Each structure stands twice: as structure tokens, then as C-alpha cells.
């Protein structure tokens, strides 16, 4: 699929979830981007004005992208592939309970995952891969991209 044709990519939080406080949201997202720039020559920059490559949104139900969320459970989030406009944007189902750790849907892991799609990643068949299609809470202390995650992302960006 198309990949971002630039290594300097900006993102912007459009709106905040009420489940976590702001600094926890900011932290999760930022950390989430760091997971991917840690193993690539990509470099992420949060902006607070103007238009970003990747727009992080919290929303419930139908939110204007023709892919409605489904309330609590089922679909947690989706993200659009690299592109202009909605391209690369990552949306989070506000009807999930977003958390810094467990007792909800962990924002950090979920954003590491969506961000991966936002960069043009597919899914993996390794259950230890962050791009694995099934969500499960894993230990963030021992969090690590799998080989499969590393091979895929560096095949798009080096
Ligand atoms: C793409 C594919 O192979 N599978 C189908 C589509 O079939 C096609 C291409 O036509 C199907 O077709 C279309 C375009 O309509 C598509 C649409 O169906 C709906 C209602 O989503 O869904 C695919 N099925 C998949 S992949 N399952 C959903 C997945 N989640 C999303 C995701 O992967 O990011 C995804 C919606 C973008 S998820 O919400 O359940 C999810 C969110 C987050 C983690 C997660 C995981 C790990 C860690 C943290 C977090 C997991 C899963
Ligand atoms: Ca949902
Ligand atoms: Ca975009
Ligand atoms: Ca919520
Ligand atoms: Zn959406
Ligand atoms: Zn996915």
C-alpha cells in the first residue's frame, strides 16, 4: 500500500477521552509513536495547530468516516492507511473504557496498533505481535515489538 513518502510525520490529538486525564492520553500516544520511531528512521512531532498527518480522534458510533463504531466491545478502534486527508488518521471508540493499564482497553497498546495501520502495516499471524488482530492486555513493562512487527515496518521505511 502507499507508505508515507516522508520521514517527518506530524500528529494531533483532536479531542480527549474523559476516561484518563490528559497527561495519561498524551503520554500513551507519544509513547505509542516512539515504539515505531525506535526501530525506524521515522520521527514524530505532535502539533497543536494546523493540519497533521495523523489525527487522533475519540468518538462514539457514527463519526463521519462511514465506519461507525459499535458501542462498548467488538470494534475498539480503526485507522486509515497513509494518505492525504483522512489518510493515516487513527480513531478510538470512546464507548470503550480507555486506561493507562488494564481494567479497560489499554490506550497505549491500542494506539501502538492503530499507528501501525496508520503507517501502512497489515496484520500479523504471531499472537505476540502488536499488529495481531485480537486485542489482549499484555505487560507494558515487558512490551516489545515482535520480529514480525520489526520486519514489516522496516520493509516500508528502513
Ligand atoms: C481487513 C481484513 O482482512 N479483515 C476485515 C475486512 O475485510 C476486508 C479487507 O474487506 C472487513 O472488510 C471491510 C473493509 O469492510 C473489515 C470491515 O469490518 C468492520 C466492521 O471492521 O474488517 C476486517 N476485520 C478485522 S481486521 N477486524 C477488526 C480489527 N480491528 C481494527 C484494527 O485492526 O485496527 C479494524 C476495525 C481497523 S479491531 O477494532 O477489532 C481491533 C482494534 C485493536 C486491536 C489491537 C490489537 C492488538 C493490540 C492492541 C489493539 C485489535 C483489533
Ligand atoms: Ca466498540
Ligand atoms: Ca490524515
Ligand atoms: Ca470511554
Ligand atoms: Zn473513524
Ligand atoms: Zn488491526
From Swiss-Prot:
Residues engaged in binding Ca(2+) 1: 19, 94, 96
Positions that bind Ca(2+) 3: 70-71, 73, 75, 93, 96
Binding site for Ca(2+) 2: 53, 85, 87, 89
Active site: 114
Tissues/organs with expression: Found in alveolar macrophages but not in peripheral blood monocytes.
UniProt record similarity statement: Belongs to the peptidase M10A family.
Designated name of the protein: Macrophage metalloelastase
Protein source organism: Homo sapiens
This protein's encoding gene: MMP12
Full protein stretch here: 106 to 263 of 470
Amino acid at each position: 500500500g502507499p507508505v508515507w513518502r516522508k520521514h517527518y510525520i506530524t500528529y494531533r490529538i483532536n479531542n480527549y477521552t474523559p476516561d484518563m486525564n490528559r497527561e495519561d492520553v498524551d503520554y500513551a500516544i507519544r509513547k505509542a509513536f516512539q515504539v515505531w520511531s525506535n526501530v525506524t528512521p521515522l520521527k514524530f512531532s505532535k502539533i497543536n495547530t494546523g493540519m497533521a498527518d495523523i489525527l487522533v480522534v475519540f468518538a462514539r458510533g457514527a463519526h463521519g468516516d462511514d465506519h461507525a463504531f459499535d458501542g462498548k466491545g467488538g470494534i475498539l478502534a480503526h485507522a486509515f492507511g497513509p494518505g492525504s486527508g483522512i489518510g493515516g488518521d487513527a480513531h478510538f471508540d470512546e464507548d470503550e473504557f480507555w486506561t493507562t493499564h488494564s481494567g479497560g482497553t489499554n490506550l497505549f497498546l491500542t494506539a501502538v496498533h492503530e499507528i501501525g495501520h496508520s503507517l501502512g502495516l497489515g496484520h500479523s499471524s504471531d499472537p505476540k505481535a502488536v499488529m495481531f488482530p485480537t486485542y489482549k492486555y499484555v505487560d507494558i513493562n515487558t512490551f516489545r515489538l515482535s520480529a514480525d512487527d520489526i520486519r514489516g515496518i522496516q520493509s516500508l521505511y528502513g
